[PDB]
From Swiss-Prot, chain B:
The RNAP catalytic core consists of 2 alpha, 1 beta, 1 beta' and 1 omega subunit. When a sigma factor is associated with the core the holoenzyme is formed, which can initiate transcription. It comes from the Bacteria. This is DNA-directed RNA polymerase subunit beta'. It comes from Mycobacterium tuberculosis (strain ATCC 25618 / H37Rv). The gene is rpoC. Belongs to the RNA polymerase beta' chain family. Induction: 6-fold repressed by starvation. DNA-dependent RNA polymerase catalyzes the transcription of DNA into RNA using the four ribonucleoside triphosphates as substrates.
From Swiss-Prot, chain D:
Keywords: Antibiotic resistance, DNA-directed RNA polymerase, Nucleotidyltransferase, Transcription, Transferase. This is DNA-directed RNA polymerase subunit beta. GO terms for biological process: DNA-templated transcription; response to antibiotic. It comes from Mycobacterium tuberculosis (strain ATCC 25618 / H37Rv). Its EC number is 2.7.7.6. Changing residue 422 to P: In strain: vr8; rifampicin-resistant. It comes from the Bacteria. DNA-dependent RNA polymerase catalyzes the transcription of DNA into RNA using the four ribonucleoside triphosphates as substrates. Changing residue 427 to W: In strain: vr10; rifampicin-resistant. Belongs to the RNA polymerase beta chain family.
Length: 175, 195, 98, 1111
């Protein structure tokens, strides 16, 4: 019992609960016992029939039991490099989309400044540009001394003027 | 020979207590990445395995001490802890190296700082650089001594931001994204500004 | 120590246990790396976000705060200090040996 | 000739070959036949060792059985290994990526010695991969080839050493058996001996001979003449067999108290038990030959015996005395000498049979362990062989061998010769071999025993030089693993036709003659002194009457890749080596014209390479088409050869097959029916016949550069069809499913024109770098939707587009048309990997023309890139007006020592223009030995030249003398080979004539299109922020420390810091620099490299308090 429990929750780099390492072990044993009796690899639907459970769960457990690999094992037939040299860092900044984002921000500032200042501020705090949080209408009213219906109307004015092709063409290109 | 280290421990204000170790540091996770490859397969730097071994041995020793066990088992666990820290700091220095899957020695901290493949002479002294290319050479007998030929495609790829700016300024592309699209599509106007 | 490329000397010496626990931002005490299903790191594991900072930028474990406006505040629930995400390359752990 | 469809290749060969070259694939087919035990191999051993006809699988099964328990009352045995029909024919297993394999069946006998019951269960052993007719395996669709390995044959190896102190000689031995513990017997620095057992440096022979049940009287009786061992036995200092046993126990198993019986049984279980020490069947016979123990007894009891040890002692001690011959009591006399480790009589060859045998042996060892565990845990009579058997380790072992092993590698097939040479190649690295770092200088050298066995020319130029080579053309592998070559035996100066085969060790005790000797057809050499190869590899003169062997033919020492080089004997060894290596990497062109000047080996090499269709059975052709040929055999029935058209080779070349027969012709069994990629009329053709002028032209052919005319580009003389494949799979994901669909977000329509609604490119549509190939869309999940994105959709009404378009796009720098699309999916009830549910693979091909930078070379070692392709006007042309096609420099040939290709050039011009020798007043003096039918040659006539018996200088000069013109009366070239030619640039004639003639050139697989790479800002690695490397990834050139030395020496500091910090490492530096250069602003100050911070954290993690101090 102690050995099995320890091998269950301690022998894996990605720890797996015993309750379902049990079913991985049982799936493996039944598939390799049926393989020799039938002569072929057991299709997961037949394995599910032996499971009394849905096959999709069988594929899920099959892909769960797969263990991680090492980043530093030599990958070539000849020993010259490791696996980790060929993995791209996804989290790294593209260094191209950053400049694009900055220029898009500049274009947005120019477009908003072209619009009337009240509308620009309304939309800026509506979508939370200058700050971290977009705000609801009542905040806009409390900061501009107007009712929320008036803010809805000025927002209607904003996207109405923003559909103007002068801004529409100059901004739609940025995609 | 003894004085060579004794005098160093004397005149320098560091206690030799640091020779023995009872609290082991843990490298940042991003320096020992666990990343999912395309296909669901997972990769690790073998450091997670050694750290896991250290953690397992330490926890089991804690359990043995708290529970109360005959001194033989406690001594065996302490020896395993010592050998696990041994493997973590320098695998294969003492005894046979700690081996994982595929029957290969595991890369400890020391092996990450040794030889050609170590950090010092592979990433610090010489680095892979951007804005560079490589191609076959062909004799250029009509060139001048200070000149050299350059393939058009390689020159375009190298001077990408340069032609990007120089063409978005000449109003060929309205914005930077359009300039990138022209460059990747290799529009005819690109070559003139490239030259 | 501010990493501004204004350096006068680089020093190396033996590290005592007091320095080792001074560097660390917590004590890793579980051999758990990634949840097999949720694909997230665990608590006090080798990849714990509380010890080593958040994996995703400006989010705690349960996502109490998903906004830039929370800077430098350690959440009361999981203790993940909501900040930039490359602190996982900077912060450090430590193990107290039996 | 002797080939039904052989083109008329006239030959300059003087003497005839008594035997034809054997099927050059016989080292792969025969070994696998031995492995399986097919009836062909069964009858093969019937007259070549029928004393014990047993296959590899049969041998392993017999060795394994019987397996029993601790009690011995219950046991299991294996017998009757029977195979089965293959699951699917070759092409479909190459299509849907399944291993070409067949089920394996064996019979298991369950015995129960307690009472006695029988259970003969036919258990399914597993799925054994099979070997195809070409000698290549198929694993997961890919075509893999295993190579034979060179290792030290287990046995006994005496050697000599100088102490370099008092110049005393010392003799050591190393009985090195496979799967056992070594014994090192030697004479120490002082007088006594050293008997190192399993690396323990104590205890001279005194304790060993005593431990064998002897005492002082035996060791003093056997050794009274050897004063060394007399002194040793006097220095015994131990009396008592049990004392010697415990002393051994000290240095054989310390850490456990010894007992009276533990050491006695330990010695037997260590050396004389065939489970912990079993020198293989090769090792036992090697020991027997080395010591003369058994000379007429069958092979049994592979474990080492005691008389072997005593004979080793006697041999070593007599060697230290300087004795010549040792006669062991109870055996024949054997001469006493040191054993060379590189002599091919001590280096065996593990073919495919031996390697698969070893892997099966490991699998059966695991089988025996698991069945031994299981046979006891279950009660008697409730246990059956099926439950005793769990075939998992055997298939695991075979899969381990075939994949992720460096001795069974990806087939190198870009022309028939590369496929031919990849098999029948001898390697030395791998499990049981020596690594290149482990390899010394001595092993890489050519041994005198290499002659006739392993070619001394064919070997790669890289670090692996000498480590791996190629088999000879006449070489044979003995059924014993040793290599062996044929040779005719001469008696009293009479040459016999009887061909006998000798190994490396059997050659020393004989005297072989020269290959090309002045034979008078009566067996008698006209001069007494003949070039012969002596015992120790020495070459010397000797009268004729005492020689007893001769080479079967010239070109016996050379391989098949080097036998195709004309005028080989006129070339330096290095240039011949490189020429043989570049022959392996030619590309298949679209026409593959046969070479004018070559060797007879081209026909055989093309025929048995397996990629040319050969009519197995004779008969008339029913019908011919590009796709297929229907041939009607004489016995009513017909056979349809399905031609393979435009198949991608493992290196992305073309493998088209064009039939060369008509609808009403008759073809004989063995005649070539269709040509492969690089074959013309069934003979090897790896290049084209190009007119050559050897003048140095205006510096465009400077430093091995080669200039070409635009005729080659326009006439498609050198152009290759190149095919690439692009796999892409849609797999299940927690986000849902990825769809192969046209619902691709934010894409135009001009790029959507060439996709079907199924979502993939239309067949026959042109693509290029960056174009989309398959539309695969993945659920994006969630992320930070930028507020700016919300304003963006608010301006145009664009949908959120909730999915991520990670579609497959053509990678950078390629284009061409699409050839085929193969799609598999789960609803197609296919055997897809668990996890993926669509997988589509697209084939894109482009007719790659010849351009600057492409490497062109001859088969004589001359190489070079295309300096320029200048138009037909600017080409030196002869008085007839035909422009030259290729111009090469003249400053390389005399320095680099490859004058053979100049002779090839002249012979090619003679063969092209045609010739006739005036036989009016008798034959001229030079043509007296020239064979008939070679005195007349029509224009564009093909010739042949054996490598070591070819056209001589006088014959070639005479041929050049009479070189009748084609159409007009114009002898363009003079008697000395040079010809006048008119400049195409200025127009005036060149002051002096230059050599011109037809040369056979080949395009190598080092094209510049797959060799140009550049990047501005690509991806970066995880741990350190350095950019990755390679062409598959976006790359980035490595600026190593050696270039750092140069930049520091220049005194350029800002450039170095730029190349280190911001151009490579400093992330904020990278983005700021890119923003500044795009914004047209000044590049900012470089920051601190990230890799240094990584190093600092790593060093901190090593308990090293490292802090950087500002002040
Ligand atoms: Zn949290």
């Amino acid at each position: 019992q102690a050995i099995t429990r320890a091998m269950a929750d301690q022998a894996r780099t990605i720890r797996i609960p015993v309750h379902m390492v049990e079913v991985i072990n049982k799936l493996g044993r039944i598939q390799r016992e049926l393989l020799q009796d039938l002569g072929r690899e057991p299709t997961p639907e037949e394995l599910a029939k032996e499971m009394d459970i849905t096959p999709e769960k069988v594929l899920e457990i099959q892909q769960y039991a797969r263990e991680p690999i090492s980043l530093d094992q030599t990958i070539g037939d000849e020993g010259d490099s490791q696996l980790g040299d060929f993995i791209e860092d996804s989290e790294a900044v593209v260094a191209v989309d950053a400049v694009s984002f900055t220029l898009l921000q500049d274009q947005l500032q120019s477009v908003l400044d072209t619009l009337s200042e009240r509308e620009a501020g309304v939309v800026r705090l509506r979508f939370g540009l200058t700050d971290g949080q977009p705000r609801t209408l009542d905040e806009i009213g409390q900061v501009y001394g107007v009712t929320r219906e008036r803010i809805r109307q000025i927002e209607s004015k904003t996207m109405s003027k923003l559909r103007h092709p002068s801004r529409s063409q100059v901004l739609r290109d940025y995609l | 020979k003894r004085l060579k280290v004794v005098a160093a421990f004397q005149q320098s204000g560091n206690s030799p207590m640091g020779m023995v170790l009872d609290a082991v540091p843990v490298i940042p996770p991003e320096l020992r990445p666990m990343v999912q490859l395309d296909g669901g397969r997972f990769a690790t730097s073998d450091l997670n395995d050694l750290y896991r071994r250290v953690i397992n041995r330490n926890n089991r020793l804690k359990r043995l001490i708290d529970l109360g066990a005959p001194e033989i088992i406690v001594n065996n666990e302490k020896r395993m802890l010592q050998e696990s820290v041994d493997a973590l700091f320098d695998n294969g220095r003492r005894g046979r190296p700690v081996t994982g899957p595929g029957n290969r020695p595991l890369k400890s901290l020391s092996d990450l700082l040794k030889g050609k493949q170590g950090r010092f002479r592979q990433n610090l002294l010489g680095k892979r650089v951007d804005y560079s290319g490589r191609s076959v050479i062909v004799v250029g007998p009509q060139l001048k001594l200070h000149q050299c030929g350059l393939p058009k495609l390689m020159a375009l790829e190298l001077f990408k931001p340069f032609v990007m700016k120089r063409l978005v300024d000449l109003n060929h592309a309205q914005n930077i994204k359009s300039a990138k699209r022209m460059v990747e599509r290799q529009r005819p106007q690109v070559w003139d500004v490239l030259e | 120590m501010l990493d501004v490329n204004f350096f006068d000397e680089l020093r190396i010496g033996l590290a005592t246990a007091e320095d080792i626990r001074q560097w660390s931002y917590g004590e890793v005490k579980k051999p758990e790396t990634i949840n097999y299903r949720t694909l997230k790191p665990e608590k006090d594991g080798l990849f714990c976000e509380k010890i080593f900072g958040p994996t995703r930028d400006w989010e705690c474990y349960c996502g109490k705060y998903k906004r830039v406006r929370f800077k430098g505040i350690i959440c009361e629930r999981c203790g993940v200090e909501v900040t930039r995400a490359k602190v996982r390359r900077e912060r450090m752990g430590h193990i107290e040996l039996a | 000739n002797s080939v039904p469809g052989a083109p008329n290749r006239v030959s300059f060969a003087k003497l005839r070959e008594p035997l034809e070259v054997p099927g050059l694939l016989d080292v792969q087919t025969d070994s696998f036949e031995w492995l399986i035990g097919s009836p062909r191999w069964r009858e093969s051993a019937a007259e070549r060792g029928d004393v014990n006809p047993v296959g590899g699988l049969e041998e392993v099964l017999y060795e394994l059985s019987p397996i029993e328990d601790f009690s011995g009352s219950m046991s299991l045995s294996f017998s009757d290994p029977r195979f089965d029909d293959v699951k699917a024919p070759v092409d479909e297993c190459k299509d849907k990526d399944m291993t070409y394999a067949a089920p394996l069946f064996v019979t298991a006998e369950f015995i129960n010695n307690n009472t006695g019951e029988i259970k003969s269960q036919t258990v399914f052993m597993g799925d054994f991969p099979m070997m195809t007719e070409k000698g290549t395996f198929i694993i997961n669709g890919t075509e893999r080839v295993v190579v034979s390995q060179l290792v030290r044959s287990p046995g006994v190896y005496f050697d000599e050493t100088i102490d370099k102190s008092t110049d005393k000689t010392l003799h050591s031995v190393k009985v090195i058996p496979s799967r056992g513990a070594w014994l090192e017997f030697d004479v120490d620095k002082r007088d006594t001996v050293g008997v190192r057992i399993d690396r323990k440096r104590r205890q001279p022979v005194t304790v060993l001979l005593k431990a064998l049940g002897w005492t002082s009287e035996q060791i003093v009786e056997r050794f009274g003449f050897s004063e060394i061992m007399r002194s040793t036995l006097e220095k015994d200092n131990t009396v008592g067999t049990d004392e010697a046993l415990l002393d051994i126990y000290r240095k054989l198993r310390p850490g456990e108290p010894p007992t009276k019986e533990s050491a006695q049984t330990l010695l037997e279980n260590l050396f004389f038990k065939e489970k912990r020490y079993d020198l293989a069947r090769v090792g036992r016979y090697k020991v027997n030959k080395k010591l003369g123990l058994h000379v007429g007894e069958p092979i049994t009891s592979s474990t080492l015996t005691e008389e072997d040890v005593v004979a080793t002692i006697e041999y070593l001690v007599r060697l230290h005395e300087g004795q010549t011959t040792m006669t062991v009591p109870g055996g024949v006399e054997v001469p006493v000498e040191t054993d060379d480790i590189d002599h091919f009589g001590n280096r065996r060859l593990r073919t495919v049979g031996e390697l698969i045998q070893n892997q099966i042996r490991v699998g059966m060892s695991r089988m025996e362990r698991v069945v031994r565990e299981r046979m006891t845990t279950q009660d008697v009579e409730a246990i059956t062989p099926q439950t005793l058997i769990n075939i998992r380790p055997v298939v695991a072992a075979i899969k381990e061998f075939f994949g992720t092993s460096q001795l069974s590698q990806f087939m190198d097939q870009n022309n028939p010769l590369s496929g031919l040479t990849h098999k029948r190649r001898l390697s030395a690295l791998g499990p049981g071999g020596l690594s290149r770092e482990r390899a010394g200088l001595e092993v890489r050298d050519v041994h005198p025993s290499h002659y006739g066995r392993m070619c001394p020319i064919e070997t790669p130029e890289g670090p692996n030089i000498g480590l791996i080579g190629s088999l000879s053309v006449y070489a044979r592998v003995n059924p014993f693993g040793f290599i062996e070559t044929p040779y005719r035996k001469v008696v009293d100066g009479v040459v016999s036709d009887e061909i006998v085969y000798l190994t490396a060790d059997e050659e020393d005790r004989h005297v072989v003659a020269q290959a090309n000797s002045p034979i008078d057809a009566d067996g008698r050499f006209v001069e007494p002194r003949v070039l012969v190869r002596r015992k120790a590899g020495e070459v010397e003169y000797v009268p004729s009457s005492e020689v007893d062997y001769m080479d079967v033919s010239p070109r016996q020492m050379v391989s098949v890749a080097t036998a195709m080089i004309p005028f080989l004997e006129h070339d330096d060894a290095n240039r011949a080596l490189m020429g043989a290596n570049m022959q392996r990497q030619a590309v298949p062109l679209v026409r593959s014209e046969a070479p004018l000047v070559g060797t007879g080996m081209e026909l055989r090499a093309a025929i048995d390479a397996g990629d040319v269709v050969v009519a197995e059975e004779s008969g008339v052709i029913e019908e011919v088409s590009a796709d297929y040929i229907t041939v009607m055999h004489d016995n009513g029935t017909r056979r349809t050869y399905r031609m393979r058209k435009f198949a991608r080779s493992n290196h992305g070349t073309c493998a088209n097959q064009c039939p060369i027969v008509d609808a009403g012709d008759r073809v004989e069994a063995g005649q070539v029916i269709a040509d492969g990629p690089c074959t013309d009329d069934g003979e090897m053709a790896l290049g084209k016949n190009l007119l050559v002028a050897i003048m140095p032209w205006e510096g465009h052919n400077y430093e091995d550069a080669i200039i070409l005319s635009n005729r080659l580009v326009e006439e498609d003389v050198l152009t290759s069809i190149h095919i690439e494949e692009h796999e892409i799979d849609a797999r299940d994901t927690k986000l849902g499913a990825e769809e192969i669909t046209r619902d691709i977000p934010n894409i135009s329509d001009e790029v959507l024109a060439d996709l079907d609604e199924r979502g993939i490119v239309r067949i026959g549509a042109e693509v290029r770098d960056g174009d989309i190939l398959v539309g695969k869309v993945t659920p994006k999940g969630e992320t930070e939707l930028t507020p700016e994105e919300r304003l963006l959709r608010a301006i145009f009404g664009e949908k959120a587009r909730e999915v991520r378009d990670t579609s497959l796009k053509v990678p950078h720098g390629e284009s061409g048309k699409v050839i085929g699309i193969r799609v598999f999916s789960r609803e197609d009830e296919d055997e897809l990997p668990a996890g993926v549910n669509e997988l589509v693979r697209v084939y894109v091909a482009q007719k790659r023309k010849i351009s600057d930078g492409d490497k062109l070379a001859g088969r004589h070692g001359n190489k070079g890139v295309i300096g320029k392709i200048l138009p037909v006007e600017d080409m030196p042309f002869l008085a007839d007006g035909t422009p030259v096609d290729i111009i090469l420099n003249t400053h390389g040939v005399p320095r680099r020592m490859n004058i053979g290709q100049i002779l090839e050039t002249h012979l090619g011009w003679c063969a092209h223009s045609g010739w006739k020798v005036d036989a009016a007043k008798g034959v001229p003096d030079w043509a007296a030995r020239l064979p008939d039918e070679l005195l007349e040659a029509q224009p564009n006539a093909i010739v042949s030249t054996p490598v070591f018996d070819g056209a001589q200088e006088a014959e070639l000069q005479g041929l050049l003398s009479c070189t009748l013109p084609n159409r007009d009366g114009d002898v363009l070239v003079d008697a000395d080979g040079k010809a006048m030619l008119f400049d195409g640039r200025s127009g005036e004639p060149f002051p002096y004539p230059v050599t011109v003639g037809y040369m056979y050139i080949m395009k190598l697989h080092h094209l510049v299109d797959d060799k140009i790479h550049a990047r501005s800002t690509g991806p970066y690695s995880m741990i350190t922020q350095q950019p990755l490397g390679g062409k598959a990834q976006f790359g980035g050139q490595r600026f190593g420390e050696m270039e750092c030395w140069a930049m520091q020496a220049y005194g350029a500091a800002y450039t170095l810091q730029e190349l280190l910090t911001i151009k490579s490492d400093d992330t904020v530096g990278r983005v700021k620099v890119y923003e500044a250069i795009v914004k047209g602003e000044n590049i900012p100050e470089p920051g601190i490299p990230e890799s240094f911070k990584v190093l600092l954290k790593e060093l901190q993690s090593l308990c090293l308090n490292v802090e950087v101090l500002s002040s």
